[PDB]
């Protein structure tokens, strides 16, 4: 296949480029690099973030908030970050624990009876993609948290629409008795304004041609098996994917005395070897370890070069 990522660059159809993979990986760093390369692709791009650590900041030395923002040294690059999103993804916890077909909307409406939080989470998640679409960016890059998954979210409200949608027809039989009994706005307005764009984005994600996931791993077993679990769960949720990234991999041969490095990268070579055979259908990447404590946009540009062209010391 192809050990570089530039296929992502060539496919201008993309609009959402997720990045995931748990463990002590600089997913933020490599995602930032992919972003800078997309900028080098002369588009209208914007990264998001969901980790609480805001590593984007340290990669950029700027403060941010819940609102899109320029980044110095760049024009079309834009950052923004939402921990409130992982917060509101907690509200559907109970639906997460079941993940059924019918009882999802049923527990949603029963909780709406309890404390009206269904539309709460709904509008909460809405505002994000609302503003996102509003600025009309070319692509959008996510940095998912190392614990959980927010793509899957969108299969929930469509199930929930099965309530509302079917509810809508009872609207007819809802008309008479009310008009024969004597804020109805919130439900109708907010839902009929959210679930349209919610349907839009949900359909959008499933498209293999504008949504793409980048898992990232390290050359060691446990993380490998983890990202394999991720791949399987992703195919379950029926999302496109072609490309994974590894990190911390030099395997040099200028000098002998790096015996520790020798055996270390021997092990890591063994494990990435085990990987390759299994992932012929995926654009493997070999992103080395920067021989320095990782800081500043310089290393970001380094990753950018390494992501464009296949690395060889």
């Amino acid at each position: 296949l192809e050990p570089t990522l530039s296929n992502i660059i060539e496919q201008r159809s993309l609009k959402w480029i997720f990045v995931g993979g748990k463990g002590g990986v600089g997913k933020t760093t490599c995602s930032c690099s992919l972003a800078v390369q997309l900028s080098k692709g002369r588009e209208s791009v914007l990264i998001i973030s969901t980790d609480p650590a805001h590593n984007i900041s340290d990669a950029f030395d700027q403060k941010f908030s819940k609102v899109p923002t320029k980044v110095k040294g760049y024009d079309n690059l834009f950052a923004m970050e939402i921990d409130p999103s992982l917060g509101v993804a907690e509200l559907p916890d109970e639906f997460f624990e079941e993940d059924n077909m019918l009882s999802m909307g049923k527990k949603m409406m029963q909780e709406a009876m309890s404390a009206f939080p269904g539309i709460d989470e709904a509008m909460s998640y809405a505002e994000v993609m609302r503003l996102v679409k509003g600025m009309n960016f070319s692509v959008v890059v996510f940095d998912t948290a190392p614990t959980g998954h927010t793509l899957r979210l969108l299969n929930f409200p469509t199930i929930v629409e099965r309530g509302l949608g079917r509810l809508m027809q009872i609207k007819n039989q809802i008309s008479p008795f009310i008009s024969q009994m004597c804020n109805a706005d919130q439900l109708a307005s907010k839902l009929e304004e959210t679930l349209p764009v919610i349907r839009s984005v949900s359909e959008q994600f499933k498209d293999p041609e504008q949504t793409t996931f980048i898992c990232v791993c390290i050359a060691e077993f446990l993380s490998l098996y983890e990202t394999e679990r991720l791949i399987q769960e992703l195919a379950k949720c029926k999302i496109d994917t072609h490309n994974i990234i590894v990190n911390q991999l030099v395997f040099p041969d200028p000098e002998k005395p790096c015996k520790m490095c020798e055996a270390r990268h021997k092990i890591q070579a063994k494990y990435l070897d085990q990987m390759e055979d299994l992932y012929e259908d995926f654009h493997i990447v070999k992103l080395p370890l920067l021989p320095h404590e990782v800081r500043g946009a310089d290393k970001v540009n380094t990753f950018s070069a390494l992501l464009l062209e296949p690395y060889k010391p």
Binding site: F221, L224, Y225, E228, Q232, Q274, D277, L278
Partner: peptide, 14 residues
């Protein structure tokens, strides 16, 4: 064995 024949293991699991 997973730690040394992960390929077959994953192909199976699938």
């Amino acid at each position: 064995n997973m730690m040394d024949e992960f390929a077959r293991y994953a192909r199976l699991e699938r």
